[PDB]
Amino acid sequence: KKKVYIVSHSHWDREWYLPYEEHHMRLIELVDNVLDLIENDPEFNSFHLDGQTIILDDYLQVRPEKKEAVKKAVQAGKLKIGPFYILQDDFLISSESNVRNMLIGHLESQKWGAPVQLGYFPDTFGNMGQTPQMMQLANLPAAAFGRGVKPISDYSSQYSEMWWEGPDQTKIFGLLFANWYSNGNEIPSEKEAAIAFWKQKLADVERYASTNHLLMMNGVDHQPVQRDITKAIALANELFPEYEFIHSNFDDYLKAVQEELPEDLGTVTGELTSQETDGWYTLANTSSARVYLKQWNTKVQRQLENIAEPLAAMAYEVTGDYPHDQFDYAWKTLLQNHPHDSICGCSVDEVHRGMMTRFENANDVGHFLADEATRQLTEAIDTSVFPEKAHPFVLFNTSGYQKTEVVTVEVEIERLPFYGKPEDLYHELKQKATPDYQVIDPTGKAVASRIVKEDVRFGYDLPKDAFRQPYMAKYLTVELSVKEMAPFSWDSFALIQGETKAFEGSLLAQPATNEMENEFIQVKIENNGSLTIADKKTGETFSKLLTFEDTGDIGNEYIFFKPTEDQGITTENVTAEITNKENSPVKASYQIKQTVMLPVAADERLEEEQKAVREFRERLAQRSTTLRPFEITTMVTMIKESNQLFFETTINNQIKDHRLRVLFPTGMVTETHEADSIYEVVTRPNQVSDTWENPTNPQHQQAFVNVHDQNKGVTIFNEGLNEYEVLADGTIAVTLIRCVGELGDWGYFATPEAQCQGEYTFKYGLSLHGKPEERFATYQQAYSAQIPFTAATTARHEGKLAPNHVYLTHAEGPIGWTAVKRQEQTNHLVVRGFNLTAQNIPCELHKETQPATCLTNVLEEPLTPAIEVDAPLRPFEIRTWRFE
Amino acid sequence: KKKVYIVSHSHWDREWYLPYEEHHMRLIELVDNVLDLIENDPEFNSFHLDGQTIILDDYLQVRPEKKEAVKKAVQAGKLKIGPFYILQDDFLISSESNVRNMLIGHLESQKWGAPVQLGYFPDTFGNMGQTPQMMQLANLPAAAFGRGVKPIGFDYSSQYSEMWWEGPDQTKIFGLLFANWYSNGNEIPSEKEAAIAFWKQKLADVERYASTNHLLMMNGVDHQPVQRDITKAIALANELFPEYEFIHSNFDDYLKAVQEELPEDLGTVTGELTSQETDGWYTLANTSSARVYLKQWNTKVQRQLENIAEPLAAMAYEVTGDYPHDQFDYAWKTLLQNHPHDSICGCSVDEVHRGMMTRFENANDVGHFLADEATRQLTEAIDTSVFPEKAHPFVLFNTSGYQKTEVVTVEVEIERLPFYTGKPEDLYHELKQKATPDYQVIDPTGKAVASRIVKEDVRFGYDLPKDAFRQPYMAKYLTVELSVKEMAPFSWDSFALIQGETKAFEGSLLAQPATNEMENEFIQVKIENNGSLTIADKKTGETFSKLLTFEDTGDIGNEYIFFKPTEDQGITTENVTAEITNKENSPVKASYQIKQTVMLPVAADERLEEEQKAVREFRERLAQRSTTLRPFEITTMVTMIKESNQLFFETTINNQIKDHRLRVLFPTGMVTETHEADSIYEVVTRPNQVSDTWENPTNPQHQQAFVNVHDQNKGVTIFNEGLNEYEVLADGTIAVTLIRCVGELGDWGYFATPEAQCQGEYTFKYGLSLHGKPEERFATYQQAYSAQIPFTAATTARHEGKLAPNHVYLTHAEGPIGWTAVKRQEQTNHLVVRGFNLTAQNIPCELHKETQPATCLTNVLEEPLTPAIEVDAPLRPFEIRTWRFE
């Protein structure tokens, strides 16, 4: 007798085709009915709460008196919660954000009960290759998913269950929804309807079954709970005597199905990105829907992971405090924008306007905590090493890499409180002469710098023990050339009156020929605005870089689709206006201004094809014949002590139904390329499979993408530009912005704000390298470019902290450093990194010559079995350190 | 020996010059330190939590594991909470929103312990006239305030910092004035020398206006951290000054002590406290026009909850036995979070107000969901089998307490092709190509109702059933126009759409397009080439000219204050060639489009930015309007229906202009001593003659739904939706401010607010109503309330039901009454109805529900009055009466 396990559930997208509160109020009805069945049906086994604990919070936010009832249902085993906080899109959120989803979920779960030990990815558009290791590092032995593997090729499976092995050889139990998570939805309680139902549903599940234990998912998207499931199940037990129907849960099913597993069970390895399909519904183009959401997500994630948390971790040694609740609050606010329908940008306009508010709030909490930690650190630094009348300031490197930047610091040099007319103080500082200032180090040695600008403006202080104090102040912005600042360290300086020590050496730019060069590269800006770069260390030359391409797009927020007759417009034949904006021995910058006459939108045919829900592949709309100027302004910046070229493109988008890309021809036709993923540098082929029909192959990227051979290589890094494609000739095409007018999917939902009108700024850059070992240096500096330097002023005072201090000594090598924070109750220092290579490398951490206490998992629990702190870093290993 | 009562507090603006979370993270630090003092310092008496309970909620959402500590702090009487939910602006939120603030503040305070029984208005920009009655109707016998009254010593001036406050209904409460502001006791020195100079000054300031030997020192200020050494400083004061007894105390103990020794010569203030006897420069009344989109959304969401969702849900309880109390509490708290004075006044930074829009969207969507749930539940219970087969029935609800007259539009689905039938694009074009039969409207009897088919539409649609998956389909919709005449209050009428010859409206066309004229049985409208209106009251014989004139001037002030540049003399549409086009014309409804293009300065000149950065006082600002001009088009839709004297206006602009204010003018033609305006449960009488101390060349006043000017023979009423700033000019011209654009926050520093320039598309809804005898003015007020409450139309299928096709849910005592609430009590589910008298006379007011009288009259907290008032007792002047039906 084959047992059939029926698990009641409801896949709840938090916000999608309706505004958030429209879904939120229907979530109240769902949970109300779930609790009613629990309290009134003694034969109701359990209800799976979609693997996300936030549903409990969203429910009790409206019905708080139900907390005790909700708690009892969880403690009785009838309401199965966890283990995640929300159901995220893996590729569109940061590596740490994926970990915090499990960490927050693990901590939120212990307010109710033991969560389900199952990774829940039912609707995730592609699954990250590091899922097995990340699951195991969070005490999750199994994972349930629905996309990425076809049940019956490297990405197929003869069984609905399988083994899933990551690049670090960590293996978990893969549970595929081979007939989707809706095969058991709406089970009939009538004879003639139940016979025809179970005759095909039992048939559909036994094609891919490897055991006598079948899985029937009793729910679907926003599905109300089947209130007569007990009657339908009891009816099924009487109509099919060979099968045994059991209202069950995932925990009992996982235990049962894995007891009678066969020996010939298959194994999938690495990413699961639907690479063996027709490529028409990968939904990868969600990486380009509403680019402003991805940019805000990148900025807030860096603010929390790489700014506020490291600084607050350092400030703990001064205060003995760590704002755990504030950080937890900021992370849950940020994670509320990480449901896959939210961060992918495939919802209605009101949903994404609401995401901007959450982005702002989480960012502001991140700035507040970073400013508190920075004040606590600088106030404890012994700045009395500087002469009197000096203006101290401290630079913080909050990353795990050697940092090389030309930074600016704004130092207040005079202050006039008003408590007379405040306007007199303004004009007083306005008419006061500004002396020559000079930067010095703690020893009094003059540091080279440049006085950029001065500003007189209103300001105020918010003391922790007194009323607000307003003032009029004068500020000097000083430019510094920081060369290879040690990771997780700080350096103190000061402004004093005196002749400024100017930068020395040859100018980086040669403006008459529109050229730049340092010791690494020689850059030439051609007439069309493209870049010709020569690698001075390898001798390789690259041409036609930074070409901009614009084509039409008549798809939706999920899928890009070029009009059939659209050839695209590029800047290859345009005539760029090139201006050298800055030129110093340490920094040079050019402004490239280009214009292309683009179609204002799609022609009038697209609207009727959208309203009629015509499939995008059958759409005949072309680009409009009415034109409108489209201006592209790009800044190209080069500094003396780095091989990275930095790009900053500005547009005021008034064009609809189009996609803008920037092109980097590498001249290398290779089998594979490399992209930044989740705790992984994933290798991907450039040749689509035999079943692939999409003329494009959009792919997800985090921080960079790379194409290289045995001699040379090009690394393109970005900020919030998560969609790329490697063309046939080896050209790296990064998508800047993609504008559509409808949601897509199951109906017609107009989304005009998905046209992304208004001003935008895209930050990206390139880095050349030679032998394949030199990739990882460009990978680290790609991570470092996303992390800004932290500078803050402070007065003269004594203190227990030295003016220059290295907080963490990191093992040099191909390692990505992603987290520095402190554990919840213990306040132990937590550091997390991961191996960039497939090789065992030495990795030893030290905090002021003190070794780490032990290695932990991502939940900051000690590893079992224990790994030695000085043990080599295994290939693709995610390692977390604990310092007491 | 006098007693010095030191009350520690912190006036906490939830969001102001910083983004919300920047203030919020500092709120966590404050409450952490207050709990530190409460749990450790044995001499720390208590801490007054700014009169708002939302501080407890905002603290626990970041630190939930501190809830037991907060409970113990409140249970110990050391954390003084309530009685409000938030500290609101009085005039800029609806009448019910003021009551919901007290109702939720009470219910929340009871969850922790009990509220401080003191009305807390420390920084409210003007106080509503009905404050004493509203305080008394919430079990609050006293109110502490800071603005509106001037202390003297030895009309709106008091010799003492204690006074009696009598409302228009003669309800009288005890008034506690912060005569030396709520910061006189801030940062008490804990050192000998500093304490002497401090108290020698502070004691003399408080004694200037003390009517008793009990003195109030407010130990706190805006966003002030709690004074950690307050215990030490108080003991030092008792040591240094033997003639005084310094006590760390609280408002409960102070109020009991000061009112026990109150002298008989105590002064009494009556009505509004709007700083009438000041110089008029710092009323901050111009906040009512700052960021008008906030006021428009607030009006929309408030009507959606008070006058749509709650009345429909109260009726839907009859068929379901359920009422979504938790959802309404969630929607109201979300809306009240936009009601702190710095929020709704529009005097914060850009990040704050973009966050308010999210709250408005969320609260509005909950009100829509709850209204659609009640609407579906009611229509599912209506017996629609009375209509013939194949008919498409629909139901019209009047969710207001007034006789409603309106030309209504109803969209009815006539066909539906589900997606499982075939390919979606095939179904779309199949319905598009299918011919449309002529349809006819019928009542349950079968008698044809006059109508007109407006338009047809074929689009995608879906259903979200409560027991199955989503249901997508392609549908065809017909838009039918009905002429509803004096529909009964709180009732519903059922109609149906059958195939047949449509019954057209009969009578003469309301509009005469050859001369740009409209007229019915009440008014005769001429639209001049000027674009202004010349109206003739056909019942009273009066004429009014130059109506609907637009005026734009510069504004170099801030979000608080309007200030015209010294050389600006204004720009008007009085000398402009308008483009007039008749859009609709029928026997029941006609509308005209008026297009006017005027050249406006793009902004102020470059001198304004320097005067803002230097924080120069606005009166000393030399900036003028820019000489660079830019086109500015004004499009107004003037609408008239057959069965109403209301002339509706809809002005739309694409505001690309900065540093200016646009108003619409209505010359009444009569110079009176006083005018009237809609306030909070009150039609307040305001003077046109400006006081002697007043120096502001303008007199901006707050309005809710309307403003009126009348004499003994004629009158003009101007109603609006979210246009809350008005001014009655010296020649009787009513000027309603449409939009006011500034670039800085103002107040204590320089805070650039470019989104306060209100750039983009805007639509202003307002109207005109004429009357004759002064008693006729109250009917225009009711219809002004009724214009803000749209009809609720809903389609349903044919089915038997337990509700009648036509039914009156509530019968109202006809007369000069405003009806503001129909909802149900949280636990008892009793039907709650609230109205108020518009006049100063005792009028009859008997309310019935299905011929059954009310059980008892209650306060605004929905509890029986003590002592009770008979349900058939006459409505007292300016009384706010609340009914309860068990």
XYZ file of N, CA, C and O in Angstrom, chain A residues 2-8 45-46 48 80 116-118 120 142-145 159-162 173-179 183 205-206 208-217 244-262 265:
252
model
N 0.729 2.065 -1.048
C 1.498 3.297 -1.159
C 0.809 4.413 -0.387
O -0.377 4.689 -0.597
N 1.556 5.054 0.508
C 1.016 6.130 1.326
C 1.063 7.446 0.559
O 2.075 7.773 -0.069
N -0.033 8.197 0.612
C -0.148 9.488 -0.057
C -0.238 10.565 1.015
O -1.196 10.593 1.798
N 0.756 11.447 1.050
C 0.865 12.475 2.076
C 0.309 13.787 1.536
O 0.818 14.321 0.544
N -0.729 14.302 2.189
C -1.384 15.543 1.793
C -1.001 16.621 2.797
O -1.304 16.506 3.991
N -0.335 17.665 2.314
C 0.149 18.758 3.149
C -0.610 20.018 2.754
O -0.412 20.556 1.658
N -1.477 20.490 3.645
C -2.202 21.727 3.397
C -1.269 22.922 3.534
O -0.448 22.986 4.453
N -4.533 17.772 10.610
C -3.159 17.507 11.023
C -2.379 18.797 11.235
O -2.049 19.147 12.372
N -2.074 19.507 10.152
C -1.270 20.715 10.246
C -1.466 21.548 8.988
O -2.072 21.106 8.009
N 1.028 24.139 6.550
C 2.368 24.643 6.274
C 2.280 26.128 5.944
O 1.624 26.516 4.970
N 2.842 24.861 11.145
C 4.254 24.647 10.853
C 4.849 25.912 10.245
O 4.425 26.351 9.171
N 10.173 24.267 10.742
C 10.354 23.151 9.824
C 11.787 23.152 9.308
O 12.298 24.180 8.845
N 12.443 21.995 9.389
C 13.831 21.854 8.947
C 13.862 21.533 7.451
O 14.242 20.446 7.015
N 13.456 22.523 6.657
C 13.362 22.350 5.214
C 13.532 23.694 4.524
O 12.797 24.641 4.819
N 12.753 26.161 1.853
C 11.531 26.321 1.071
C 11.790 27.317 -0.055
O 11.896 28.524 0.190
N 17.509 19.482 4.148
C 16.737 19.280 2.931
C 16.257 20.617 2.384
O 16.226 21.628 3.089
N 15.878 20.604 1.107
C 15.379 21.788 0.426
C 14.295 21.384 -0.562
O 14.445 20.400 -1.292
N 13.206 22.145 -0.576
C 12.093 21.916 -1.487
C 12.030 23.051 -2.498
O 12.019 24.227 -2.117
N 11.991 22.699 -3.782
C 11.988 23.694 -4.844
C 11.129 23.193 -5.997
O 10.748 22.021 -6.054
N 13.560 11.144 -10.934
C 12.759 11.043 -9.724
C 12.423 12.434 -9.206
O 13.180 13.387 -9.402
N 11.273 12.535 -8.536
C 10.860 13.801 -7.940
C 11.758 14.213 -6.780
O 11.755 15.387 -6.395
N 12.517 13.278 -6.217
C 13.490 13.559 -5.177
C 14.885 13.244 -5.700
O 15.056 12.448 -6.628
N 15.886 13.878 -5.098
C 17.237 13.823 -5.641
C 18.218 14.322 -4.589
O 17.828 14.847 -3.543
N 19.369 16.865 0.547
C 18.281 16.117 -0.070
C 17.389 17.080 -0.846
O 16.775 17.975 -0.252
N 17.316 16.896 -2.158
C 16.510 17.759 -3.004
C 15.116 17.199 -3.199
O 14.950 16.048 -3.613
N 14.111 18.020 -2.900
C 12.705 17.644 -3.037
C 12.071 18.548 -4.089
O 11.699 19.690 -3.799
N 11.944 18.036 -5.308
C 11.385 18.800 -6.414
C 9.872 18.644 -6.460
O 9.343 17.538 -6.322
N 9.175 19.767 -6.644
C 7.742 19.748 -6.932
C 7.581 19.438 -8.417
O 7.355 20.315 -9.255
N 7.714 18.148 -8.741
C 7.724 17.722 -10.137
C 6.409 18.034 -10.835
O 6.396 18.321 -12.037
N 5.296 17.978 -10.108
C 4.004 18.401 -10.627
C 3.555 19.714 -9.994
O 2.357 19.946 -9.813
N -0.531 20.384 -7.240
C -1.129 19.142 -7.719
C -2.251 18.655 -6.808
O -3.174 17.972 -7.269
N 1.932 11.857 -10.031
C 2.969 11.824 -9.007
C 3.815 10.553 -9.088
O 4.983 10.563 -8.685
N 3.261 9.459 -9.614
C 3.996 8.202 -9.668
C 4.957 8.122 -10.847
O 5.786 7.206 -10.878
N 7.335 10.306 -11.368
C 8.601 10.771 -10.824
C 8.830 10.304 -9.393
O 9.762 10.777 -8.737
N 8.006 9.390 -8.893
C 8.174 8.883 -7.541
C 9.245 7.802 -7.503
O 9.296 6.926 -8.371
N 10.107 7.871 -6.489
C 11.100 6.837 -6.243
C 10.784 5.989 -5.022
O 11.481 4.997 -4.781
N 9.765 6.353 -4.248
C 9.365 5.622 -3.057
C 7.861 5.388 -3.095
O 7.153 5.881 -3.977
N 7.376 4.624 -2.119
C 5.945 4.420 -1.934
C 5.282 5.568 -1.184
O 4.124 5.435 -0.772
N 5.987 6.682 -1.001
C 5.499 7.827 -0.239
C 5.318 8.998 -1.197
O 6.300 9.589 -1.658
N 4.066 9.328 -1.494
C 3.724 10.374 -2.444
C 3.445 11.685 -1.720
O 3.094 11.710 -0.538
N 3.599 12.786 -2.454
C 3.446 14.129 -1.909
C 2.381 14.874 -2.703
O 2.503 15.024 -3.924
N 1.346 15.342 -2.007
C 0.261 16.114 -2.606
C 0.186 17.465 -1.906
O -0.132 17.533 -0.713
N 0.481 18.533 -2.644
C 0.490 19.888 -2.100
C -0.910 20.481 -2.224
O -1.375 20.772 -3.329
N -3.149 4.780 0.621
C -3.463 5.271 1.956
C -3.230 6.774 1.985
O -2.110 7.237 1.744
N -4.285 7.531 2.274
C -4.234 8.986 2.271
C -4.102 9.497 3.699
O -4.910 9.148 4.567
N -3.084 10.322 3.936
C -2.754 10.810 5.270
C -2.539 12.315 5.196
O -1.642 12.782 4.485
N -3.361 13.067 5.922
C -3.083 14.480 6.141
C -1.832 14.594 7.002
O -1.827 14.156 8.158
N -0.766 15.156 6.444
C 0.546 15.086 7.077
C 1.228 16.445 6.964
O 0.595 17.472 6.694
N 2.542 16.449 7.183
C 3.363 17.648 7.145
C 4.673 17.309 6.444
O 4.924 16.156 6.079
N 5.518 18.324 6.255
C 6.787 18.100 5.570
C 7.751 17.287 6.425
O 8.506 16.461 5.900
N 7.743 17.510 7.742
C 8.686 16.825 8.622
C 8.461 15.319 8.607
O 9.414 14.538 8.493
N 7.203 14.889 8.722
C 6.908 13.461 8.691
C 7.139 12.874 7.303
O 7.572 11.723 7.176
N 6.859 13.646 6.251
C 7.071 13.146 4.897
C 8.556 12.993 4.593
O 8.982 11.980 4.028
N 9.360 13.998 4.955
C 10.801 13.915 4.729
C 11.404 12.721 5.456
O 12.262 12.018 4.909
N 10.967 12.474 6.693
C 11.450 11.312 7.430
C 11.028 10.017 6.750
O 11.791 9.044 6.719
N 9.822 9.992 6.183
C 9.307 8.774 5.568
C 9.940 8.523 4.204
O 10.363 7.400 3.907
N 10.015 9.557 3.361
C 10.504 9.361 1.999
C 11.993 9.032 1.993
O 12.467 8.295 1.119
N 12.750 9.546 2.960
C 14.184 9.298 3.002
C 14.541 7.991 3.698
O 15.726 7.647 3.763
N 13.554 7.259 4.216
C 13.831 5.958 4.812
C 13.930 4.871 3.748
O 14.788 3.986 3.838
N 13.070 4.926 2.732
C 13.037 3.937 1.658
C 13.605 4.494 0.356
O 13.117 4.184 -0.733
N 14.642 5.320 0.449
C 15.240 5.889 -0.750
C 16.009 4.817 -1.520
O 16.666 3.965 -0.914
N 15.941 4.827 -2.847
C 16.717 3.869 -3.637
C 18.166 4.310 -3.794
O 18.523 5.471 -3.584
N 19.505 7.003 -6.845
C 18.973 8.359 -6.834
C 19.963 9.315 -7.488
O 21.163 9.278 -7.199
